[PDB]
Design an enzyme around this catalytic site. Structure first.
Site, mmCIF file in Angstrom:
data_model
loop_
_atom_site.group_PDB
_atom_site.id
_atom_site.type_symbol
_atom_site.label_atom_id
_atom_site.label_comp_id
_atom_site.label_asym_id
_atom_site.label_seq_id
_atom_site.Cartn_x
_atom_site.Cartn_y
_atom_site.Cartn_z
ATOM 1 N N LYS A 61 -3.862 -11.302 25.046
ATOM 2 C CA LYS A 61 -2.676 -10.696 25.662
ATOM 3 C C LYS A 61 -3.069 -9.745 26.797
ATOM 4 O O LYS A 61 -2.320 -9.522 27.757
ATOM 5 C CB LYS A 61 -1.903 -9.950 24.572
ATOM 6 C CG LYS A 61 -1.174 -10.854 23.581
ATOM 7 C CD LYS A 61 -0.231 -10.056 22.690
ATOM 8 C CE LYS A 61 0.711 -10.928 21.888
ATOM 9 N NZ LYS A 61 0.069 -11.672 20.777
ATOM 10 N N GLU A 97 8.509 -5.207 24.677
ATOM 11 C CA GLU A 97 8.884 -5.500 23.306
ATOM 12 C C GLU A 97 7.622 -5.824 22.503
ATOM 13 O O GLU A 97 6.645 -6.355 23.033
ATOM 14 C CB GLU A 97 9.895 -6.667 23.267
ATOM 15 C CG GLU A 97 9.274 -8.073 23.329
ATOM 16 C CD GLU A 97 8.571 -8.498 24.615
ATOM 17 O OE1 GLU A 97 8.816 -7.873 25.667
ATOM 18 O OE2 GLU A 97 7.796 -9.485 24.573
ATOM 19 N N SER A 133 -7.627 -17.107 20.017
ATOM 20 C CA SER A 133 -6.776 -16.184 20.759
ATOM 21 C C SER A 133 -7.055 -14.723 20.380
ATOM 22 O O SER A 133 -6.819 -13.837 21.194
ATOM 23 C CB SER A 133 -5.302 -16.555 20.614
ATOM 24 O OG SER A 133 -4.924 -16.612 19.242
HETATM 25 C C1 LIG Z 1 0.540 -12.618 19.988
HETATM 26 C C2 LIG Z 1 -0.546 -13.533 19.612
HETATM 27 C C3 LIG Z 1 -0.421 -14.937 19.597
HETATM 28 C C4 LIG Z 1 0.876 -15.667 19.802
HETATM 29 O O1 LIG Z 1 1.526 -15.436 21.077
HETATM 30 P P1 LIG Z 1 1.385 -16.519 22.237
HETATM 31 O O2 LIG Z 1 2.278 -15.964 23.353
HETATM 32 O O3 LIG Z 1 1.913 -17.807 21.685
HETATM 33 O O4 LIG Z 1 -0.042 -16.651 22.676
HETATM 34 C C5 LIG Z 1 -1.520 -15.677 19.266
HETATM 35 N N1 LIG Z 1 -2.717 -15.134 18.971
HETATM 36 C C6 LIG Z 1 -2.881 -13.815 19.004
HETATM 37 C C7 LIG Z 1 -4.213 -13.237 18.638
HETATM 38 C C8 LIG Z 1 -1.806 -12.982 19.304
HETATM 39 O O5 LIG Z 1 -2.025 -11.655 19.311
HETATM 40 N N1 LIG Z 2 5.143 -10.455 18.244
HETATM 41 C C1 LIG Z 2 3.881 -10.586 19.056
HETATM 42 C C2 LIG Z 2 4.036 -11.640 20.166
HETATM 43 C C3 LIG Z 2 5.237 -11.497 21.045
HETATM 44 C C4 LIG Z 2 6.306 -12.308 21.226
HETATM 45 N N2 LIG Z 2 7.099 -11.737 22.183
HETATM 46 C C5 LIG Z 2 6.529 -10.590 22.591
HETATM 47 N N3 LIG Z 2 5.404 -10.433 21.929
HETATM 48 C C6 LIG Z 2 3.470 -9.218 19.613
HETATM 49 O O1 LIG Z 2 4.299 -8.372 19.898
HETATM 50 O O2 LIG Z 2 2.292 -8.948 19.786
#
Ligand SMILES: *Cc1c(COP(=O)(O)O)cnc(C)c1O
Ligand SMILES: N[C@@H](Cc1c[nH]c[nH+]1)C(=O)O
Ligand SMILES: O=P(O)(O)OCCNS(=O)(=O)c1ccc(OC(F)(F)F)cc1
Ligand SMILES: [Cl-]
Ligand SMILES: [Cs+]
Ligand SMILES: [Cs+]
Ligand SMILES: [Cs+]
Ligand SMILES: [Cs+]
Lengths: 268, 393
Positions: free
Chosen positions: B86, B108, B376
């Site tokens: 991220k 968010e 990820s």
């Molecule tokens: C938030 C998250 C995801 C899922 O979100 P995507 O937008 O689908 O990538 C996947 N892996 C990790 C480690 C995350 O923190």
């Molecule tokens: N719920 C996850 C992924 C996400 C979806 N939308 C925004 N963020 C997070 O906040 O890390």
């Protein structure tokens, strides 16, 4: 039908503005909501804006977020809302009825079918809060095929291109936003602009109703003096519901007093 | 009117209140400008290299695949600063916010990882950050909430609706609808209204670009398939993007199957939901028969976005990418396996991708296949969850 056209013509004949309350259908329950709505009408509402409870009302502030939540606590569904709407129309033949929708509830099981159901129960307009003019084509086309007015929103800083689009695409009334942000009585918007109201008139738009933050008689009078055809008030009405949940008779009395005062402000 | 296509086939669009259209148009213009600006590109590259630690490793996992004709590499987004992919796109969005002259960030978060990423980028780059988080998530994610606060972000619990991620998504947009003139909305996945699916993809695409260079270096050919978990779709589209035009490379997205598709307790809207309009986009989603939005369930809190990015729905529709699901129990087994056999603790999110790869290998162990799983994130955050389950066994 031509309910908004007929209303505005009648109001124009009397040098009068429209006062239009918003409530959530089925807040705080179906039976009480029906009584609330009859009270709004008897107290002088010119038209109604009615919300179908939705899980994610992202154009609404806390007051109306809470109304949706109360309706859901009472188990209110869109089907039940359409039942309510049919009965409201059966009681009151001429009052214009507009729905406040979110896109998913319209698109859910088919856009055309949604507008057909609106026509069947005698709704006059639909405002889909999360569909901007840019995405509006299938919604406005379906609306018009079913004799429903699609309502569009004119933000306070709208440029000429947007004014022309809202004037061309909308019907029934043009929604004139008082400010940015979301619904709420706690945040007062502006007296709009001579420019906007005049440009909408220049472009033969549907008559304007100002909405967002309208919570006092003085604001209704101001909206009409500025050249709007009238004003919408939601949160201020819903706050009276919220305040009086335990006291249904007092709720109706306070709703009556408030609506009467708001309506009086619209008269020349 | 827009500069770029807001749709991927039928999916996507800009389903926001009229008041927010100028904000989206402004953001699109700034993005298109930034993408042509070598100085912007150099600043982003510098942060990615010297702050975040790119490029991330590509690790060949020999122990896991012993005795089969599978060769498996992991793309090590777990090693990026913050412990998940991220970080890449928050740095790019923070620089866009600065480009537009904004000093405030809204974000968010559900499980908290996006919140932490937004907070760290904002701390580094001198932005005031406020994060919306459903009250139920606040309660259950105290570690991430504390990280956000240490990094100087304001965390605002959301008590409306279901008090979870979708409700935080709404509140972020409600705030932005009034504050866009001074604040940028740093959306956390490759979803929501245009231009966010496009921007998030472009600010995650170095994942696949690096993977391609690294696999060519090590193996002298492209992967047979690249495999990524799909919450909202950011890590997956970041891995997929540079391979879309390499027609021989399989793209496999893995949605959470939760307790099992047949139970209804899952987070797999792309394959098992229904197209709707919400959160600014037309996309498959978790919804009731009447069209009320529902929650996603997974053991991994990070996969609980109740829809999916529109580019994924599109790639599926044309058959360019295939989407599958992995249950809680499958993800847990993959987590344990990676720890024991490779000494890498994977995020439970990423463990969904690994589990599908393990299935590809195990079902057909004599099939020659060169696979890359996008790892990820790292799974330090998940050790108690995994502990508590494995204790109750
Ligand atoms: C938030 C998250 C995801 C899922 O979100 P995507 O937008 O689908 O990538 C996947 N892996 C990790 C480690 C995350 O923190
Ligand atoms: N719920 C996850 C992924 C996400 C979806 N939308 C925004 N963020 C997070 O906040 O890390
Ligand atoms: O008096 P307030 O401040 O509560 O405002 C009540 C407004 N109720 S409504 O149905 O007209 C209404 C109209 C438009 C809305 O959003 C949109 F502009 F994005 F479309 C939301 C509600
Ligand atoms: Cl289209
Ligand atoms: Cs008056
Ligand atoms: Cs490195
Ligand atoms: Cs092998
Ligand atoms: Cs998903």
């Amino acid at each position: 039908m031509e309910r908004y056209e007929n209303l505005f013509a009648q109001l124009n004949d009397r040098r009068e503005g429209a006062f239009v309350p918003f409530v959530t259908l089925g807040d705080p329950g179906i039976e009480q909501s029906l009584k609330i709505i009859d009270t709004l009408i008897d107290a002088g509402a010119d038209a109604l804006e009615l919300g179908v409870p939705f899980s994610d009302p992202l154009a609404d502030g806390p007051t109306i977020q809470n109304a949706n939540l109360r309706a859901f606590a009472a188990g209110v569904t869109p089907a039940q809302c359409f039942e309510m709407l049919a009965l409201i129309r059966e009681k009151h033949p001429t009052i214009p009825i507009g729905l406040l929708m979110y896109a998913n509830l319209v698109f859910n099981n088919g856009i055309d079918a949604f507008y057909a159901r609106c026509e069947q129960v005698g709704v006059d307009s639909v405002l889909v809060a999360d569909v901007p003019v840019e995405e509006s084509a299938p919604f406005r086309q379906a609306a018009l095929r079913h004799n429903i007015a699609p309502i569009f929103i004119c933000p306070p800083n709208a440029d000429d291109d947007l004014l022309r689009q809202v004037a061309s695409y909308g019907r029934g009334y043009t929604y004139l936003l008082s400010r940015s942000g979301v619904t709420g009585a706690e945040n007062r918007g502006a007296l709009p602009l001579h420019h906007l109201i005049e440009k909408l008139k220049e472009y033969h738009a549907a008559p304007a109703l100002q909405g967002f933050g309208i919570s006092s008689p003085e604001q209704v009078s101001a909206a009409v003096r500025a050249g709007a055809a009238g004003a919408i008030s939601g949160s201020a009405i819903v706050k009276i519901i919220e305040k009086n949940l335990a006291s249904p008779k007092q709720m109706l009395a306070e709703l009556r007093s408030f609506v009467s005062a708001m309506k009086a402000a619209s008269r020349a | 009117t827009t500069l770029l296509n807001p749709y991927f086939g039928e999916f996507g669009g800009m389903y926001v209140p009229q008041i927010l259209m100028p904000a989206l148009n402004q953001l699109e213009e700034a993005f298109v400008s930034a993408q042509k600006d070598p100085e912007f590109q150099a600043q982003f590259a510098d942060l990615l290299k010297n702050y975040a630690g790119r490029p991330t490793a590509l690790t060949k996992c020999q122990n896991i695949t012993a005795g089969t004709r599978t060769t498996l590499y992991l793309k090590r987004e777990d090693l990026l600063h913050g412990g998940a992919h991220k970080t890449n796109q928050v740095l790019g969005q923070a620089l866009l916010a600065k480009r537009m002259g904004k000093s405030e960030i809204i974000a968010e978060t559900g499980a908290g990882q996006h919140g932490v990423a937004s907070a760290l980028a904002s701390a580094l780059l001198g932005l005031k950050c406020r994060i919306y988080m459903g009250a139920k998530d606040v309660e259950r994610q105290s570690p991430n909430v504390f990280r956000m606060r240490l990094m100087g972000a304001e965390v605002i619990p959301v008590h409306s609706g279901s008090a979870t991620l979708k409700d935080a998504c709404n509140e972020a947009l409600r705030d932005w609808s009034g504050s866009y003139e001074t604040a940028h909305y740093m959306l956390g996945t490759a979803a929501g209204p245009h231009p966010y699916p496009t921007i998030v993809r472009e600010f995650q695409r170095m994942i696949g670009e690096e993977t391609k260079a690294q696999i060519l270096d090590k193996e002298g050919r492209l992967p047979d398939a690249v495999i990524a978990c799909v919450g909202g779709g950011s890590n997956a589209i970041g891995m997929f993007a540079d391979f879309i035009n390499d027609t021989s490379v399989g793209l496999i997205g893995v949605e959470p199957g939760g307790h099992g598709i047949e139970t209804g307790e899952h987070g797999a809207p792309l394959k098992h939901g229904r197209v709707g309009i919400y959160f600014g986009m037309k996309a498959p989603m978790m919804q009731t028969a009447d069209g009320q939005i529902e929650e996603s369930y997974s053991i991994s809190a990070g996969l609980d976005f109740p829809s999916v990015g529109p580019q994924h729905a599109y790639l599926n529709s044309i058959g360019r990418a295939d989407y599958v699901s992995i249950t809680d129990d499958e993800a847990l087994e993959a987590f344990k396996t990676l720890c024991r056999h490779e000494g890498i603790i994977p995020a439970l999110e990423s463990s969904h991708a690994l589990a599908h790869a393990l299935k590809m290998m195990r079902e057909q162990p004599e099939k020659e296949q060169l696979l890359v799983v996008n790892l990820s994130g790292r799974g330090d955050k998940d050790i108690f969850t995994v502990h508590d389950i494995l204790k109750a066994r």
